[PDB]
Design an enzyme around this catalytic site. Sequence first.
Site, short mmCIF file in Angstrom:
data_model
loop_
_atom_site.label_atom_id
_atom_site.label_comp_id
_atom_site.label_asym_id
_atom_site.label_seq_id
_atom_site.Cartn_x
_atom_site.Cartn_y
_atom_site.Cartn_z
CD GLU A 35 16.47 34.96 57.47
OE1 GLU A 35 17.10 35.95 57.03
OE2 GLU A 35 16.24 33.92 56.79
CG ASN A 46 17.73 40.00 49.37
OD1 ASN A 46 17.56 38.79 49.23
ND2 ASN A 46 17.57 40.58 50.55
CG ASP A 48 16.18 40.36 44.27
OD1 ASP A 48 16.35 41.24 45.19
OD2 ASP A 48 15.28 39.50 44.37
CB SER A 50 14.11 42.76 46.91
OG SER A 50 14.86 41.62 47.20
CG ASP A 52 15.47 39.95 52.90
OD1 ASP A 52 14.67 40.00 51.97
OD2 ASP A 52 16.24 38.95 53.08
CG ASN A 59 12.99 40.13 49.22
OD1 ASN A 59 12.37 40.16 48.15
ND2 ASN A 59 14.21 40.59 49.33
#
EC number: 3.2.1.17
Length: 129
Positions: A35, A46, A48, A50, A52, A59
């Site tokens: 990650e 991201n 969308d 959002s 992280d 997120n």
Amino acid sequence: KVFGRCELAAAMKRHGLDNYRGYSLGNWVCAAKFESNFNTQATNRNTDGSTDYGILQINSRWWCNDGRTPGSRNLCNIPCSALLSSDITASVNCAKKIVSDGNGMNAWVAWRNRCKGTDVQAWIRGCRL
């Protein structure tokens, strides 16, 4: 902060993630490796809209507030920037909520694709824990 491998293992263990919801420490170290590369400051947008944040790439739609993800939730009740701290307390507290949400560690896409099913104990090799 860029944690060492065993450094991170020790901190995760002290914060109660070893076998939290049945997931051994190496699962959590593996997830953090893929990650964030063990970097607390990691941030990634991201598709969308959002973002992280942090060592476990938590997120901003469901999990923290960053003020820029319309429609999202803040289920850990914290600012996303608090997930970038050198002390991983907030990330661990939030991760405990995420992994309890119903799909276990599959919530972390790197974990499902890169850790799940593998020899995750390798990630704690050598560590005095």
